[PDB]
Amino acid sequence: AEIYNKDGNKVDLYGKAVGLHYFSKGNGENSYGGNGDMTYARLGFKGETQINSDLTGYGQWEYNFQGNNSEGADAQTGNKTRLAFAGLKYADVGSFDYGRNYGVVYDALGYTDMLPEFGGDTAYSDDFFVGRVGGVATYRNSNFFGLVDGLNFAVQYLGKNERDTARRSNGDGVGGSISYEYEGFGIVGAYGAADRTNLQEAQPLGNGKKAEQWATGLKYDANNIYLAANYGETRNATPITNKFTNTSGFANKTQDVLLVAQYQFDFGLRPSIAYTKSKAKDVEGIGDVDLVNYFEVGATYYFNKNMSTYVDYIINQIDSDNKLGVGSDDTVAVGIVYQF
Amino acid sequence: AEIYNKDGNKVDLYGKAVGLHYFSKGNGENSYGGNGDMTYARLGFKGETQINSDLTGYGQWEYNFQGNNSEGADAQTGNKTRLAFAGLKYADVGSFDYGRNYGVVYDALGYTDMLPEFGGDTAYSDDFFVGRVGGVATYRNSNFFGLVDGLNFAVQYLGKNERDTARRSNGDGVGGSISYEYEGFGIVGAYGAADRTNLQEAQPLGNGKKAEQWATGLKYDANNIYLAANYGETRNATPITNKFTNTSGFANKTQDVLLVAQYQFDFGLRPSIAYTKSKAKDVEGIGDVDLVNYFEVGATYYFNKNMSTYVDYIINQIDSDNKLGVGSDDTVAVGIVYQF
Amino acid sequence: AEIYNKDGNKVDLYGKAVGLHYFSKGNGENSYGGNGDMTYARLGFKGETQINSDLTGYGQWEYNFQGNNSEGADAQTGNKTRLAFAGLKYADVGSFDYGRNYGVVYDALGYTDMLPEFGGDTAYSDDFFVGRVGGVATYRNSNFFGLVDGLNFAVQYLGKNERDTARRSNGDGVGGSISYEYEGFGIVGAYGAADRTNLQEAQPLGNGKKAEQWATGLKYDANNIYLAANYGETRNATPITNKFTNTSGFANKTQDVLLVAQYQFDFGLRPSIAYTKSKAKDVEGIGDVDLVNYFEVGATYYFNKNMSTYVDYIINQIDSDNKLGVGSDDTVAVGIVYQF
């Protein structure tokens, strides 16, 4: 949906309206993702202008609006800016941009973020390199310098964000990524490291002086089938919670496995199967604990370019004896999607 | 104001800027609607796409922005999402949609919601069936199945919304509506019932286990004159306040009368007269009390399709001895409207 | 970027994405403007319709979105409506509008508000006549009545805004402005006076019963050079802070000097030099104190109509012995700008 393309600047305003309802037992106190109305809406703009033949300029913004709130004092719950960045792009040297963007481990973790509603549990927001972080300076090179094509690599720097809370805070850091596609396949390497703030060190769960994250994945996005497998590891950069002690902090070391498989049909139904197991290792008091564990059967039906429905059915395999109390119940998600 | 109609999807972005100032005595502590600056602004999008000849898809979102706030810590006061929904529509069977939409009693109560600023006092927001409620699943049939035209009927289901406050909360419920227009006239039937939450039961004002609402109205929207009369009743679903006790809750039974009359001229001035009397019956301690009571003379001048002014003058007839302290003073509202 | 111009109504949606990073020593506790990520984004619409040949109608809205926040509970920090107003315009008598707009001293103080990021320190928001105030009723005349052109004058009325805080509050007031441009030059007179609220009187810093502001400036915006000089004075209308006592209030009398100089080149780099000195006189306990004091060297490079970069380097000349603890450190600002 492009609205203004006149001089050298093309501007498209994009948004979506999603009507969701979650299905769980109880009130969602022991469940994955909860229970009840969780509808929302999105709105943002993407910009692109040509300064000359080679150097271009771009910027993007995106917002999250929530419809499951009331019209009272609880109106802005989960209303937030997902993207806010701007930068330039030259021909062969690459592109620099700055603002609120993703991390460089999301190049690996984004391969299994293809489910209807859930999935991409390892891609936590404000988790130093795996989600949308405010204050990132990213340099991306698409095809090496024109030397070979289908060989992506990027380099990121992270700015110091000392907030009031310890879950969203981070410090200075450096990351990088290497990707390669050929014959419809795909392989991604990614690694990032950042130094912690003193508010994050004083938390009871987790102790350390540097937060390291890495991941590597594969891909078979060709011939209407999708297959991917991400394996990653994380030191001092995983947000955990202890509901038995009411103490929150980070995990010392965490190992993550994600799988996904999809098939697209000609009329437009897309079945999906997925498996995710994230295990936190050597946390204080507990030992080895499993954070995320589910099988998944779901399906997405695409009516056209703009209208869609999806059903997403979580089979939680946490064995209801978790020492962190992560919540172990099955969840069904049924949604209706319009976008432009 | 439609901006993008290219492939099968027409998207129009709509908004308005309203500059309001209320006129009352004192600070609005004993007044209807208050005193001072109450300007605001709206913004949203409406979407419509054709999947094929018969099945279409649609979605809508709307936001309220407030200009009477400052640029300090009180910025988002009364900033909220009014509409957020999405659904499909087939040819003869009807249309299903889900999200944040109106209720099915608003088909009756919307006939007298035609004033410049005020009016539609019975149409409270988050009052189970008479305003915009988040989590509604509505099925609407326009003309019966093509069998007769000018015969509307709808069926709604309400989802359980157990919030932190008791005024916005609700439970599961079922409602329905029947409408009929012929020869420019109109007649609407509407009824809805929902079961209360346990936070609503523990409130001191009002006690009960089910919230029932119904209304029925008439219409003469033809030949540039407007005439309508809504009569409705409500059991356990009316938000009241006791300023003498500082206790808030619901009313046991409430009976509501609304009248309106308008005339449009060729140059564009629209005078208005209205009468609203809402009476709460058998509340604890008080007995029978009158919540809403006013005469009204107002006028709206339309410059063109987009620019307008209106004056709206409340003659409050609450006799300054109300046992709930509802506020009994006259209020003038003067506004300037731009929209697109 | 105009999107809808069809019937008589032209509507343009405008926004920008700015990626900023501030450079200071420490955490910005003794600095001008702070330290760290300060990126943001803007979005709004401007409207214009012709009712007939002479009378037109217009309205505008603008919002501030902040990207330096997280996606947690601190999401809406500094998110606010900058503009919200609407009104009409006739041919020769002028134009009336109402809502949230600027003040009439901003006609004088806006001449030196031409820096890349900083500058316009005297133009405080919600400071009765020098910033964007909610509840203003402004009448502006462009060229006198068609009698002479290049002679602007305006008259403003201020409504009573009794808020919860004393910094954003104000009372009823009257202001006016006179401007004159000829041969590329410019000269502006401006004055405004308003009566204080009782919450503003009870504050320890500053005491008085009326807030008076005035300013007068010059201009040489011709032949690609810019030169301007604003001198203004202010009685009982300047927000000050005492970090040594943790007491906040207003200043009794304040005198302000602003200078600016710019040069535009053909390829698009714009160097800038500026000098601002604001001095508060006869405050309680301190005496005469200097609030704002800096030299400035900065530059803005315009790539095209839509893409730009700027560097802005504060040379703070507060002598680190200020009795109010205003903060005395140098600050560099580096930004990347996209707009449409």
| DSSP assignments along B94-145, one per residue | -EEEEEEE--SSHHHHGGG--SSS----SS-TTSSSSS-EEEEEEEEESSTT
Instruction: Using CB atoms, list chains with 3+ pairs below 8 Å to chain A.
Output: B, C
Q: Sort strands A331-339 and B2-5 into parallel, antiparallel or unpaired.
A: unpaired
Task: Output helix, strand, coil percentages for chain A, rounded to the nearest 5.
Answer: 5, 55, 40
User: Domain extents for chain A?
Assistant: 1-340
- Alpha helices (runs of H) in chain A, residue ranges in sequence order: 106-109, 198-201
- Shortest alpha-carbon distance between residue A72 and chain B (Å): 7
- Beta bridge partners of residue A222, listed in sequence order: A225
Put simply, the answer to whether A39 touches B99 (Cβ < 8 Å) is yes
- Residue C2, CA distances (Å) to A20, A131, B307, C5 in order: 34, 34, 19, 7
C203: tokens are 């504050």
Exposed, middle or buried: residue A85 (CB in 10 Å: 0-12, 13-18, 19+)? buried
Q: How far apart, in whole angstroms, are the C-alpha atoms of residue A261 and residue A249?
A: 33
- Shortest alpha-carbon distance between residue A270 and chain C (Å): 31
Exposed, middle or buried: residue A184 (CB in 10 Å: 0-12, 13-18, 19+)? exposed
The DSSP line for B144-212 is: TTSSSSSEEEEEEEE--B--SSSSS-B--EEEEEEEE--TT-EEEEEEEEEEPPHHHHTSSS---SEEE
Q: How far apart, in whole angstroms, are the C-alpha atoms of residue A147 and residue B328?
A: 80
- Residue B321, CA distances (Å) to B282, B286, C235 in order: 17, 12, 46
Q: How far apart, in whole angstroms, are the C-alpha atoms of residue A263 and residue C42?
A: 40
- Residue C329, CA distances (Å) to B318, C35, C63, C118, C335 in order: 61, 11, 31, 14, 20
The DSSP line for B291-331 is: EEEEEEEEEEEE-SSSEEEEEEEEEE---S--TT------E
Q: How far apart, in whole angstroms, are the C-alpha atoms of residue B131 and residue A71?
A: 10
User: Under a CB-based contact definition with an 8 Å cutoff, are residues B294 and B32 in contact?
Assistant: yes
Interacting residues of C212 by C-beta distance below 8 A, sequence separation 6+: C191, C192, C193, C234, C235, C236, C237
Given the structure tokens 């009397």, which residue do they identify? B277
A149: tokens are 């094509």
Interacting residues of B333 by C-beta distance below 8 A, sequence separation 6+: B20, B21, B22, B23, B33, B116, B117, B118, B310, B311, B312, B313, B314
Given the structure tokens 């695409």, which residue do they identify? A302
Residue B27 contacts C where some CB pair is shorter than 8 Å:
yes
Strands (E), C144-268: 151-158, 173-180, 186-195, 210-219, 225-235, 239-242, 247-250, 253-263
Residue B268 contacts C where some CB pair is shorter than 8 Å:
no
B319: tokens are 């006799």
Q: How far apart, in whole angstroms, are the C-alpha atoms of residue A105 and residue A176?
A: 8
Q: How far apart, in whole angstroms, are the C-alpha atoms of residue B61 and residue C3?
A: 19
Residue C290 CA neighbour count, 13 Å, CB half: 15
Handedness of CA B339, B340, C1, C5 (dihedral sign): negative
The angle at the Cα of B160, spanning B154 to B162, to the nearest 5 degrees, equals 140
Q: How far apart, in whole angstroms, are the C-alpha atoms of residue B154 and residue A160?
A: 55
Residue B107 φ then ψ, to 5°: -65, -35
Question: Position C205: which residue type?
Answer: L
User: Under a CB-based contact definition with an 8 Å cutoff, are residues C279 and C261 in contact?
Assistant: no
Chain C contacts of B72, Cβ < 8 Å? 126, 163, 165, 167-168
- Residue A269, CA distances (Å) to A222, A331, B179, C34, C210 in order: 17, 21, 38, 52, 70
* Euclidean distance between the first and the last CA atom of chain C, given in angstroms as a whole number: 6
Closest of B6, B196, B340 to residue C58, by C-alpha: B340
C67: tokens are 């990207």
A-facing residues of C in 286-305 (CB < 8 A) are 303-305
Closest of B323, B39, B244 to residue C60, by C-alpha: B39
Size of interface A-B (CB pairs under 8 A): 140
Q: Residue A42: how many CB atoms within 10 A of its CB?
A: 16
Virtual torsion, Cα A325, A328, A333, A339, nearest 10 deg = 40
- Beta bridge partners of residue C123, listed in sequence order: none
Q: How far apart, in whole angstroms, are the C-alpha atoms of residue A62 and residue A78?
A: 14
Chain B contacts of C13, Cβ < 8 Å? 13
Of B49, B100, B167, the CB nearest to A72: B167
Interacting residues of A53 by C-beta distance below 8 A, sequence separation 6+: none
The DSSP line for A180-208 is: E--TT-EEEEEEEEEEPPHHHHTSSS---
Q: How far apart, in whole angstroms, are the C-alpha atoms of residue C139 and residue C175?
A: 11
The radius of gyration of chain C's CA atoms, rounded to the nearest angstrom, is 21
Residue C200 φ then ψ, to 5°: -80, -25
Q: How far apart, in whole angstroms, are the C-alpha atoms of residue C156 and residue C105?
A: 10
Q: Supply the DSSP symbol for C107.
A: H
- Alpha helices (runs of H) in chain C, residue ranges in sequence order: 106-109, 198-201
Question: Position A332: which residue type?
Answer: V
Put simply, the answer to whether C8 touches B36 (Cβ < 8 Å) is no
Helix (H) or strand (E) holding A14: strand A9-23
Q: How far apart, in whole angstroms, are the C-alpha atoms of residue B176 and residue B103?
A: 9
Question: Position C276: which residue type?
Answer: T
User: Under a CB-based contact definition with an 8 Å cutoff, are residues A235 and A194 in contact?
Assistant: no
Residue C165 three-state SS = coil
Q: How far apart, in whole angstroms, are the C-alpha atoms of residue B71 and residue C161?
A: 13
Closest of C229, C257, C238, C273 to residue C118, by C-alpha: C273
Interacting residues of C148 by C-beta distance below 8 A, sequence separation 6+: none
Put simply, the answer to whether B72 touches C132 (Cβ < 8 Å) is no
User: Under a CB-based contact definition with an 8 Å cutoff, are residues A41 and A29 in contact?
Assistant: no
User: Under a CB-based contact definition with an 8 Å cutoff, are residues B46 and B60 in contact?
Assistant: yes
Q: How far apart, in whole angstroms, are the C-alpha atoms of residue A59 and residue A89?
A: 11
The angle at the Cα of A338, spanning B10 to A57, to the nearest 5 degrees, equals 75
Q: Supply the DSSP symbol for C111.
A: G
Closest of C119, C121, C265, C111 to residue C185, by C-alpha: C111
Q: How far apart, in whole angstroms, are the C-alpha atoms of residue A292 and residue A255?
A: 11
Interacting residues of A267 by C-beta distance below 8 A, sequence separation 6+: none
User: Under a CB-based contact definition with an 8 Å cutoff, are residues C251 and C289 in contact?
Assistant: no
Closest of B164, B160, B250, B245 to residue B201, by C-alpha: B250
Helix (H) or strand (E) holding C92: none
Question: Position B265: which residue type?
Answer: F
User: Under a CB-based contact definition with an 8 Å cutoff, are residues B324 and B241 in contact?
Assistant: yes
Q: How far apart, in whole angstroms, are the C-alpha atoms of residue C83 and residue C159?
A: 16
Q: How far apart, in whole angstroms, are the C-alpha atoms of residue A170 and residue A125?
A: 12
User: SS3 sequence, A254-316?
Assistant: EEEEEEEEEECCCCCEEEEEEEEEEEEEEECCCEEEEEEEEEEEEEEEECCCCEEEEEEEEEE
Question: Position C35: which residue type?
Answer: N
- Beta bridge partners of residue A317, listed in sequence order: none
* Euclidean distance between the first and the last CA atom of chain A, given in angstroms as a whole number: 6
Q: How far apart, in whole angstroms, are the C-alpha atoms of residue A196 and residue A213?
A: 13
The DSSP line for C273-298 is: EEEEEEEEEEETTTEEEEEEEEEEEE
User: Under a CB-based contact definition with an 8 Å cutoff, are residues A12 and A2 in contact?
Assistant: yes
The angle at the Cα of A95, spanning A90 to A97, to the nearest 5 degrees, equals 130
* Euclidean distance between the first and the last CA atom of chain B, given in angstroms as a whole number: 6
A83: tokens are 């993207």
Of C6, C63, C160, the CB nearest to B65: C63
B-facing residues of C in 121-140 (CB < 8 A) are 125-126, 132, 134-135, 137
Q: How far apart, in whole angstroms, are the C-alpha atoms of residue B152 and residue B180?
A: 6
Please count the residues of chain B: 340
Q: Residue A246: how many CB atoms within 10 A of its CB?
A: 7
Residue B192 CA neighbour count, 13 Å, CB half: 35
Q: How far apart, in whole angstroms, are the C-alpha atoms of residue B213 and residue B235?
A: 6
- Shortest alpha-carbon distance between residue C46 and chain B (Å): 10
User: Under a CB-based contact definition with an 8 Å cutoff, are residues B80 and B63 in contact?
Assistant: yes
The DSSP line for C17-55 is: EEEEEEE-STTSSSSSS-SEE--EEEEEEEEEEESSSS-
- Residue A165, CA distances (Å) to A162, A199, C69 in order: 8, 8, 12
Put simply, the answer to whether C2 touches A3 (Cβ < 8 Å) is no
Chain A contacts of B135, Cβ < 8 Å? 21, 36-37, 39, 68
